[PDB]
């Protein structure tokens, strides 16, 4: 098990330190690797550490920037990155080097680098419009607008509704604030008898709102 | 330092088809490995030492190659195999760009819904009009907004889902954002959709008063 750290937000110029805690195997016998993944690009190798000896191998591109340490008695490899620029916004994985393949990998830590400030979302009902009657299928949704940072969690009827739900990827507007839509498809008839509520929770703001979407 | 180039970068394939993806090593390298990643998970060990499949990798996958060209072939494409495939080499620790593999299915024309601004958004002075193209294939769809039957440019954004798991269709939303002032100057808001599975483009409209 390689349990990595939480989502990390940061301003340009700053620095960040993110852990990768290991369990099971004997931490000192295996090099720990750190790979960067940035949307629209592949996987980039940053470097590795041998915690038994602390010798390290760095990719040239990250030499002045990343630093790999390992507090051996605590089974936690670390990595700080320095002078964060917009291009370090990405997902960082640590993975164990078994020898000829990376075999385990931690879930990722997302770092967002931006000058922008936390903003909770405004939630707006996208009321059962189009085909609502003459269709047999009606679509309803919530518009989760102007929030920063990612992520937001939208769910319908406290989880009691899954079928037909399409929550779309957040898009980032000119203002550097994101917005998304969660839309659900229901049979036109249900509109008179059910109540559709979407539940939006944005934790970096501690925003939890529920919205009825009535036709 | 060894640069790996993968081709194709996107590939659609019907289940039962045979796919083959390349990863070419710029400088002759001894062993090639291959990782698979599905949306929202870490890479998984798939092929290693040019052709040994790891433990779990079903019989249909197959590494092959020497020096500068390696390949991953799937014999009978299955629906569960759609993912991005990256090849990896151990001297520079480089990886190649990925080959996303999607499943081909039959053309399915979008249902288009359109939604007017809620009142709550309007009191706060902005107006977002959403147009939804629901469950379709291929992913290529073209959505044009017209306000008082005149085309709009530069003030919409769209987001597309990743291919549905049991269905294989995409969904796309396009949002037009206006100030309340601008919204109120115009009357007919229409979403025009062009897509393969449509003999003529669907338009869906609402009129601001009505």
Q: Where are the domains of chain B?
A: 1-105, 106-208
DSSP structure string for chain B:
-PPEEEE-SEEEE-TT--EEEEEEESS--S-EEEEEE-TTS--EEEEETTTEE-SS--TTEEEEEETTEEEEEESS--GGG-SEEEEEESSS--B---EEEEE----BPPEEEEEPPPHHHHHTTEEEEEEEEEEEBSS--EEEEEESSSB--SSEEEEEPPPPTTT--EEEEEEEEEEHHHHHH--EEEEEEE-TT-SS-EEEEEES--
Task: For residue B118, list chain A residues with Cβ-Cβ distance below 8 A.
Answer: 124-127, 143
Distances (CA, A) of A204 to A138, A171, A182, B130: 33, 18, 20, 26
| CB-based contact A143 B33, cutoff 8 Å | no
Determine the Cα–Cα distance for residues A189 and B173; give it in Å rounded to an integer: 24
Distance CA A202, CA A170 (A): 13
Q: Determine contact, residues A102/A42, Cβ cutoff 8 Å.
A: no
Mutation target for A interface from B41, B116, B122, B132: give the one with most A CBs within 10 A.
B132
Question: Distance (Å, rounded) from C-alpha A11 to C-alpha A43?
Answer: 23
Of A82, A115, A148, which residue constitutes the final position of a domain? A115
Same CATH topology for B1-105 and B106-208: the answer is yes
Based on the fold, state whether residues A18 and A83 are members of the same structural domain: yes
- B114 → chain A, closest CA residue: A130
Measured between beta carbons, the chain A residues lying within 8 angstroms of B51 are: none
Same domain, A11 and A111: yes
CB A76 within 8 A of CB A18: no
Q: Are residues A154 and A215 in the same domain?
A: yes
Which residues have a Cβ under 8 Å from the Cβ of A75 and sit 6 or more positions away?
A21, A22, A23, A27
Identify the domain boundary among A81, A115, A149: A115
- Choose the final residue of a domain: A93, A115, A137: A115
CB B35 within 8 A of CB B44: yes
As given in the structure block, the two tokens for residue B5 are 């180039």
The SS3 of residue A86 is: helix
Cα A120–Cα A126–Cα A131 angle in degrees, nearest 5: 165
For chain B positions 105-134, those within 8 Å of chain A (CB to CB) are: 111-118, 120-121, 124, 128, 130, 132, 134
Residue among A102, A105, A139 minimizing CB distance to B132: A139
H or E, element range at A172: strand A171-172
Q: Determine contact: B87 vs chain A, CB below 8 A.
A: no
- Is the Cβ of B199 closer than 8 Å to some Cβ of chain A? no
Torsion of CA A104, A106, A112, A113, to 10 degrees: -60
Domain B106-208, what architecture?
Sandwich (2.60)
Indicate if A123 and A177 belong to the same structural domain: yes
Instruction: List all residues 6 or more positions away from B182 whose beta carbon is below 8 Å from its beta carbon.
Output: B127
Rounded to 5 degrees, φ, ψ at B106 are -80, 145
Judge if A150 and A109 occupy the same domain: no
Is the same domain home to A56 and A68? yes
Pairing of strands B10-13, B99-103: parallel
End-to-end CA distance of chain A: 48
Strand partners, B143: B193
From CA A137, how far away is CA B28, in angstroms rounded? 57
CA distances (Å), origin A157, targets A128, A197, A198, B24: 16, 5, 6, 50
Are A7 and A87 found together in one domain?
A: yes
Out of B93, B161, B177, closest to residue A45 by CB = B93
Can you give the resolution of this entry in Å? 2.6
Q: Identify whether residues A176 and A202 lie together within a single domain.
A: yes
Looking at the DSSP bridge assignments, the partners of residue B72 are B21, B63
B94–A45 C-beta distance less than 8 A: yes
The answer to whether A152 touches A203, Cβ cutoff 8 Å, is no
Cα(A59)–Cα(B95) distance, integer angstroms: 13
Burial class (CB in 10 A: 0-12, 13-18, 19+), A84: buried
Q: Which whole-number Å values give the CA distances from B33 to A4, A24, A44, B22, B210, in the listed order?
A: 24, 25, 15, 12, 61
Considering only CB atoms, which chain A residues are within 8 Å of B124?
Answer: 122
Task: Note down the domain range covering A200.
Answer: 116-215
Q: What are phi and psi of B122, to 5 degrees?
A: -60, -45
What is d(CA B102, CA B124) in angstroms, rounded to the nearest whole number?
A: 41
Using CA atoms, how far apart are residues A142 and A184, in angstroms rounded to an integer? Answer: 9
Closest CA to B78 of B16, B169, B19, B162: B16
Residues A123 and A23 in one domain: no
Structure tokens at B199: 């003999």
What is the C-alpha radius of gyration for chain A, rounded to an integer number of angstroms? 22
Domain count across chain A? 2
Contact B45 A179 (CB under 8 A): no
Asked if A12 and A64 sit in the same domain, the reply is yes
A187/B47 Cα distance (integer angstroms): 45
Name the CATH architecture for the domain at B1-105: Sandwich (2.60)
Q: Is A193 on the interface with B (CB under 8 A)?
A: no
Question: Minimal CA–CA distance to B158: which of B125, B188, B116, B128?
Answer: B128
Match 């993944």 to its residue by tokens.
A37
Burial classification of residue B152, based on how many CB atoms lie within 10 Å of its CB (0-12 exposed, 13-18 middle, 19 or more buried) = middle
The bridge status of strand B188-194 relative to strand B202-207 is antiparallel
Residue A48: left (phi > 0), alpha (psi -120 to 50), or beta? Answer: beta
**Which CATH number goes with the domain that contains A78?**
2.60.40.10
Chain A positions touching B99 (Cβ under 8 A) are none
Pairing of strands A109-113, A8-10: parallel
Residue in A41, A101, A141 nearest the CB of B48: A101
Answer for the pair A23, A75: CB distance below 8 angstroms, yes or no: yes
Shared domain check, A176 and A70: no
Scan residues 12-31 of B and list those with Cβ closer than 8 Å to A.
31
Closest Cβ opposite residue B173 in set A107, A173, A183: A183
Distances (CA, A) of B144 to A144, B189, B202: 23, 11, 11
With tokens 């291009």, the residue in question is: A87
Sequence-ordered list of residues with C-beta below 8 angstroms from that of A189, at least 6 positions apart, any chain = none
Instruction: Render B24-58 in DSSP notation, one character per residue.
Output: EESS--S-EEEEEE-TTS--EEEEETTTEE-SS--
| Phi and psi, residue B96, nearest 5° | -90, 170
> Which one-letter DSSP state was computed for residue A160?
T
Instruction: State the Rg of chain B over Cα.
Output: 23
Integer Cα distance of A40 and A38 in angstroms? 6
Q: Is the peptide bond before A149 cis (omega within 30 degrees of 0)?
A: yes
A7, A82: one domain: yes
Other CB atoms within 10 A of residue B41 CB: 12
| Residue given tokens 């907004």 in the structure block | B145
Chain B neighbors of A143, CB-CB under 8 A:
118, 121, 128, 130, 175
Q: Which A residues in the span 103-142 are in contact with B, Cβ-Cβ below 8 Å?
A: 103, 105-108, 122, 124-127, 129-131, 137, 139, 141
| Beta carbons of A126 and B118 less than 8 Å apart | yes
CA distance A15 to B143: 42
- CB distance from A173 to chain B under 8 Å? yes
**Integer Cα distance of A168 and A184 in angstroms:** 11
CA distance A141 to A123: 10
Q: Biggest alpha carbon distance in chain B?
A: 70
Residue pair B130/A213 in contact (Cβ under 8 Å)? The answer is no
Burial class (CB in 10 A: 0-12, 13-18, 19+), B108: middle
């Amino acid at each position: 098990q390689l349990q990595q750290s939480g989502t990390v937000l940061a301003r340009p110029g700053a620095s960040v330190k993110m852990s990768c805690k290991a369990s099971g195997y004997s931490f000192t016998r295996y090099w720990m690797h750190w790979i960067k993944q940035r949307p629209g690009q592949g996987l980039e190798w940053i470097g590795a550490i041998y915690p038994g000896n602390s010798d390290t191998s760095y990719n040239q591109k990250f030499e002045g920037k990343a630093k790999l340490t390992a507090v051996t008695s605590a089974s936690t490899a670390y990595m700080e990155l320095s002078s964060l620029t917009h291009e370090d916004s990405a997902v960082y994985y640590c993975s164990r080097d078994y020898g000829y393949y990376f075999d385990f990998w931690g879930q990722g830590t997302t770092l967002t680098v931006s000058s922008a400030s936390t903003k909770g979302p405004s939630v707006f009902p996208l009321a059962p419009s189009s085909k609502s009657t003459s269709g047999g299928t009606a679509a309803l949704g919530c518009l989760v607008k102007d929030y920063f940072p990612e992520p937001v969690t939208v769910s319908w009827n406290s989880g009691a509704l899954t079928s037909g739900v399409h929550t779309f990827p957040a898009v980032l507007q000119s203002s550097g604030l994101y917005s998304l839509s969660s839309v659900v498809t229901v049979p036109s008839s249900s509109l008179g008898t059910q109540t559709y509520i979407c539940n939006v929770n944005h934790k970096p703001s501690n925003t939890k709102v529920d919205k009825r979407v009535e036709p | 330092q060894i640069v790996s180039t993968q081709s194709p970068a996107i590939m659609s394939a019907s289940p039962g088809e045979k796919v083959t993806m390349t990863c070419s090593a710029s400088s002759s390298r001894s062993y090639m490995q291959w990782y698979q990643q599905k949306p929202g998970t870490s890479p998984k060990r798939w092929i290693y030492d040019t052709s040994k499949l790891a433990s779990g990798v079903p019989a249909r996958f197959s590494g092959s190659g020497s020096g500068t060209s390696y390949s991953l072939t799937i014999s009978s494409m299955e629906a569960e195999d759609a993912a991005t495939y990256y090849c990896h080499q151990r001297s520079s620790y480089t990886f190649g760009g990925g080959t996303k593999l999607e499943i081909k299915r039959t053309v399915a024309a979008p249902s288009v819904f359109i939604f007017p601004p809620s009142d709550e958004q309007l009191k706060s002075g902005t107006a977002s009009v959403v147009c939804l193209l629901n469950n379709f294939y291929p992913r290529e769809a073209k959505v044009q907004w017209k306000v008082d039957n005149a085309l709009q440019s530069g003030n919409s954004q769209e987001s597309v889902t990743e291919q549905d798991s049991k269905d294989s269709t995409y969904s796309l939303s396009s949002t037009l954002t206006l100030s309340k002032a601008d919204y109120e100057k115009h009357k007919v808001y229409a979403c025009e959709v062009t897509h393969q599975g449509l003999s003529s483009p669907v338009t869906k409209s609402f009129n601001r008063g009505e």
